[PDB]
Write a protein that binds this ligand. Structure first.
Ligand SMILES: OC[C@H]1O[C@@H](O)[C@H](O)[C@@H](O)[C@@H]1O
Length: 292
């Protein structure tokens, strides 16, 4: 039922490295493939050993505790246990044609968080807006357009070592969508005040676990936790100006519907939020295909 596909594209991000070909029937690790010969690649930046990266497996003093909280490094996958073979993790979604870590710092799961902040779209009078096709109100969420992607996306990022997911969600939203890193500390508190209120009133976990990402390898992969914080009355997000963080091209409130084109698997997350919030989704019924 559909193997990961982005995790098998070439060349590997930021390189000219080509992955070994993996036929769809041979994606699952359960499938025997004695001749499987993935290319080995770990980015120079990762091999250099920065603070956010693990050492190579051979590193004498390195004894990772996979599938567990390993000190300041969360090695548990949100999709359950992952196998350890040849002393290293095996991607839970299957073969990718490349071993090593590529651009990912950690062996195993590399955690990210995606805060989906939503509010109902409102008119000049502060009332919700009903869509005629669905009869449901239009919901909006805060999206950013990165300069490196030029694609609209949920404002998320990597969990920092020793940081809790709830903290990552709040930090990323503030830094990326409210440009909090460029605030006078005084405003950083009016923000943490509004976000404190927001991040405690109406939240739902939308998705947790593996994400098909082109940075994934046989031994390291991305995982995210997408969580929706919703402002039902609009009173929390009404007087909060959006301002793109240094690494977000633009930021804006985006109307949600099934025509929305988003980065990665963010459109699927948004569809789930619309479902849970009873928001408008179907833009075109395709009824004219029978309308006569
Ligand atoms: O692709 C999975 C995740 O990767 C992270 O680097 C991004 O910041 C997230 O928005 C994305 O959901």
């Amino acid at each position: 039922e559909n193997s990961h596909n982005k995790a098998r594209t070439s060349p590997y991000p930021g390189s000219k490295v080509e992955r070994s070909q993996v036929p769809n029937e041979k994606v699952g690790w359960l499938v025997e493939w004695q001749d499987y010969k993935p290319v080995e690649y770990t980015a120079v930046s990762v091999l250099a050993g920065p603070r956010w990266a693990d050492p190579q497996i051979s590193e004498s003093n390195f004894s990772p505790k996979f599938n567990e909280k390993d000190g300041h490094v969360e090695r548990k996958s949100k999709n359950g246990l992952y196998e350890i073979e040849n002393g290293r993790p095996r991607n839970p979604a299957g073969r990718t044609g490349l071993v090593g870590r590529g651009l990912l710092g950690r062996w195993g799961p590399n955690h990210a968080a995606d805060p989906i902040i939503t509010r109902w779209k409102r008119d000049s009078s502060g009332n919700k807006i009903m869509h005629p096709v669905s009869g449901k109100h239009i919901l909006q969420f805060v999206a950013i357009k990165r300069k490196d992607c030029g694609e609209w996306a949920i404002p998320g990022g990597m969990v920092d070592p020793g940081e809790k997911i709830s903290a990552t969600l709040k930090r990323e939203f503030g830094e990326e969508a409210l440009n909090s890193l460029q605030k006078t500390s005084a405003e950083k508190r009016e923000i943490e005040e509004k976000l404190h209120k927001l991040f405690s009133q109406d939240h739902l976990v939308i998705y947790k676990g593996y994400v098909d990402d082109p940075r994934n390898t046989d031994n390291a992969w991305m995982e995210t936790e997408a969580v929706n914080y919703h402002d039902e009355t609009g009173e929390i997000m009404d007087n909060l100006m959006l301002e793109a963080g240094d690494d977000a091209g633009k930021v804006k409130w985006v109307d949600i519907n099934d025509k929305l084109k988003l980065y990665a698997s963010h459109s699927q997350f948004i569809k789930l939020v619309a479902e849970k919030r009873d928001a408008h989704w179907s833009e075109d019924s395709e009824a004219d295909c029978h309308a006569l």
